[PDB]
Design a protein around this ligand. Structure first.
Ligand SMILES: Nc1ncnc2c1ncn2[C@@H]1O[C@H](COP(=O)(O)OP(=O)(O)O)[C@@H](O)[C@H]1O
Ligand SMILES: Nc1ncnc2c1ncn2[C@@H]1O[C@H](COP(=O)(O)OP(=O)(O)O)[C@@H](O)[C@H]1O
Ligand SMILES: [Mg+2]
Ligand SMILES: [Mg+2]
Lengths: 73, 146, 375, 375
């Protein structure tokens, strides 16, 4: 049916701006777990294009799931 | 960590209690559940340091400044929370403190630190929290699947 | 190559080719726009000497080359050399096939028509790009500025130009173009270094003087107070080690070199200066726009990376503007790339994807298609 | 929307749309009746630029728009633009559905027939109102005046008109209509500001001159005494800061601008003036009415918000009227809305509810139904 969406806060909740120096900053952690979480944080390789926005991340995840379900019954 | 649920930005007093469910028994249910599926004993505490960090990031807030003229700088109002997270996560405080308000544009060989405003400081903080918790969650799934 | 077919942005403005993919925060290829050709005989047999060296390699081998900028004052003058610059841009630095990526070229406003027409002809006919779009460079600087309202100057290597924009609407009757930029400041610095006693006349030595300009020059706030300060003592006198030799020691030339950008009578160019063409570009707009221009004066391109040019700019414009106006000179440290960065932001827009000039309609209409679909 | 189905009153007179619900003491929506359309190219991609901006939004974005009043001298001239004004009135400012509320439109007396006919056609056919009623505007000003006996002038933005009424009975042979109002005073103020040295010719600058007229102009009592007073010294000279810039300083233009309303030969209009059309509107009535008109001279509309227009009005009419008459110029501070407020009082009457022009009888008779049931 005709679902009513309230537009209050769509832009604030699509913004996934995490950039280079945050992954570098947590890559330089003495905690080896957080450094193990962020392999993109090395400055010895360039940080490429950022996966923003979060809606494109969720579209990418649903697209991954649909590449999963298509080869199955 | 403090213990009152009004003391955190990501929580409130109005959500502290499901009427029939207590959190401590489910917490011990989880820490009993992690022993079967291969999570070691310092490992779970190392994950709870990360969940502690994701809880503690939200108490950081930002204010603008007058120099420079454009683009306008944001700064941390008080760095008690920054000191507790930077001691907690074992990070030098100048690294993360510079990492809230600036970002390095790095060209072919040249890099520079530029200002973020107040709102984009809140977006970098929010994105740091939920990206940290998200990649923690995916790492837990990989660790189970190992 | 590239994992995706993401569009290319190739800012080739007048003196420094910088290019990359859309969605990036910084260009992946930055190299000077030079073509060096050897002027001496090759006496060592079987070494591997080339016919012409392009860009950074010509900057390395410059001791035995002559250096020719194929583009001057924003106008391409050697199309075969510029074809070498683009061939080196896609195939050597980026290492990508241009047949799979749309390209976003930048020009200066008030340019020749055959510039954008023949640039379109070389993009579609020689390199076979699927789609292209030539856009005004300061508009792109306002994209990376994060604003839809403001007056912009970039000051590349060959051209500075003010574009005032209000609420997304261009004001093309108030666009100022001044052909005074970093290459002219390099030549004037060659003249005043010849005044001190250091004779640079070679094109390689011209690049040395360009490095002196980039490393030691700064914009004074009061030119007579800094002038009498340097006349007083050796307080601001700074030394520079030349490539492969001796140490020079330059004094007032540090601020006489970019003061030509504010006083174009130093190089003998009758104009108003960068602050007064900015102010006249504001005053040629409608009246209820003007304060929003003063609060969003954007200085976000190339040559304006001097120390103290924002303070001098706000001093001169605040002296020109009436009182009770808020003059705000937006000068980020993201300069010298923000014209490219707004190229990436413009290429990454969803609604922009109908505004590309593709094949088939270039192939229908010919090289005047940019004068249909570009601004 | 609205909790009730209370009737709407939409006073759209000539230059300032003000509307609301019945039973209110003040209109909930007041915005200028302008339609601004962009005259420059949109160069920023994906901003959210519109085709045309209406009302207060067009007043904000006026630096990049051209402003067109869809109604001039009380006569609607652009019906599609006026459809945008009404669409913005019900749906954007009031945020209500017009299919559930009766509407009370206002016109000027001695108007074209196709004005009220086509206005009726757009109210029933485009917006689908259940009932409408078009009424003469100065009669409504006498409703908010609290009187059933008096002569009324309102002076909107496009038309001033005297309606004399005695004991509830209209005197339509003595209705005066003078097409001299605030927009003409704005144009004459543009001319005499051009005389001083300030050149305003743009429609946005026309709105600036309108703001100068509203903020700094006043009606002199003796035009030659105030004229020689301003010729004597700088006593009455007042300064105004322009939008986004410099400060102007205006002198005798403060009282030469509204004196055109008393002397229409300034703008070259052969007529008698507002005081002499008021007096002639009194003298064209029957004799035993006249003193009750003089004791209830109502000046309760738009343009007449100048300082000192009631003293000048009582001076001129008292000079024209015979002695032993009590001339009383009713000029409340409830002006500029009292034509609307009496619209609310007329719509809130119980016995008025049979005088609405509904559907089904408009649908029986066609757009001439107003010439059956409206005055
Ligand atoms: N640090 C600097 N300080 C002074 N001048 C500079 C500096 N960096 C670049 N320049 C000058 O600006 C020119 C390049 O301008 P740019 O905006 O990159 O032009 P393009 O449109 O070709 O992208 C250089 O060739 C040089 O003359
Ligand atoms: N304070 C004021 N002093 C002088 N003139 C005014 C003042 N306020 C408004 N006006 C003029 O009166 C006009 C408003 O008249 P109004 O009766 O609202 O028109 P409408 O008939 O459309 O309701 C404006 O266009 C303006 O020129
Ligand atoms: Mg460039
Ligand atoms: Mg009115």
């Amino acid at each position: 049916g005709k679902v009513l969406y309230q537009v209050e806060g769509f832009v604030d909740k699509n913004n996934d701006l995490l950039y280079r120096d945050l992954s570098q900053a947590m890559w330089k952690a003495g905690h080896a777990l957080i450094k193990s979480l962020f392999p993109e944080g090395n400055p010895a390789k360039v940080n490429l294009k950022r996966p923003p926005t979060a809606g494109s991340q969720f579209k990418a995840s649903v697209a991954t799931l649909m590449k999963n379900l298509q080869t199955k019954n | 960590l403090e213990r009152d649920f009004s003391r955190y930005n990501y929580l409130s007093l109005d959500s502290a209690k499901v009427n029939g469910v207590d959190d401590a028994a489910n917490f011990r249910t989880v820490r009993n559940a992690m022993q079967i599926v291969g999570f070691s004993d310092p490992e779970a505490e190392s994950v709870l340091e990360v969940v502690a960090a994701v809880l503690k990031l939200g108490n950081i807030e930002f204010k603008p400044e007058s120099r420079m003229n454009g683009l306008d700088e944001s700064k941390i109002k008080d760095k008690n929370e920054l000191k507790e997270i930077c001691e907690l996560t074992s990070i030098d405080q100048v690294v993360l403190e510079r990492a809230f308000s600036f970002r390095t544009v790095e060209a072919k060989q040249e890099k520079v630190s530029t200002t973020l405003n107040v709102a984009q400081a809140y977006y970098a903080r929010d994105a740091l929290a939920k990206n940290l918790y998200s990649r923690l969650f995916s790492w837990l799934v990989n660790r189970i699947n190992e | 190559d590239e994992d995706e077919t993401t569009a290319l942005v190739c800012d080739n403005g007048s003196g420094l080719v910088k290019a990359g993919f859309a969605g990036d925060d910084a260009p992946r290829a930055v190299f000077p726009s030079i073509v060096g050709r050897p002027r001496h005989q090759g006496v060592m047999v079987g070494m591997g000497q080339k016919d012409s060296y392009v860009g950074d390699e010509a900057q390395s081998k410059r001791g035995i080359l002559t250096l020719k900028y194929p583009i001057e004052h924003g106008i391409i003058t050697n199309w075969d050399d510029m074809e070498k610059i683009w061939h080196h841009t896609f195939y050597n630095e980026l290492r990508v096939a241009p047949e799979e990526h749309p390209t976003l070229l930048t020009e200066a406003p008030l340019n020749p028509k055959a510039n954008r027409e023949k640039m379109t002809q070389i993009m579609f006919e020689t390199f076979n790009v699927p789609a292209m779009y030539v856009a005004i460079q300061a508009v792109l600087s306002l994209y990376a500025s994060g604003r839809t309202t403001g007056i912009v100057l970039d000051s590349g290597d060959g051209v500075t130009h003010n574009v005032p924009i209000y609420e997304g609407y261009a004001l093309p009757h108030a666009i100022m173009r001044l052909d005074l930029a970093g290459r002219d400041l390099t030549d004037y610095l060659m003249k005043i270094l010849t005044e001190r006693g250091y004779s640079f006349v070679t094109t390689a030595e011209r690049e040395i003087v360009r490095d002196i300009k980039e490393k030691l020059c700064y914009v004074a706030l009061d030119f007579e107070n800094e002038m009498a300060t340097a006349a007083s003592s050796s307080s601001l006198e700074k030394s520079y080690e030349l490539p492969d030799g001796q140490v020079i020691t330059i004094g007032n030339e540090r601020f006489r070199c970019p003061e030509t950008l504010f006083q174009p009578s130093f190089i003998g160019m009758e104009s108003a200066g960068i602050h007064e063409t900015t102010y006249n570009s504001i005053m040629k707009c409608d009246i209820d726009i003007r304060k929003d221009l003063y609060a969003n004066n954007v200085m976000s391109g190339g040559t304006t990376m001097y120390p103290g040019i924002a303070d001098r700019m706000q001093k001169e414009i605040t002296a020109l503007a009436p009182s009770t106006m808020k003059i705000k000179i937006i000068a980020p440290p993201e300069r010298k790339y923000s014209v490219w960065i707004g190229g990436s932001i413009l290429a990454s827009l969803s609604t922009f994807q109908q505004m590309w000039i593709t094949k088939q309609e270039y192939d229908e209409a010919g090289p005047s298609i940019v004068h249909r679909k570009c601004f």
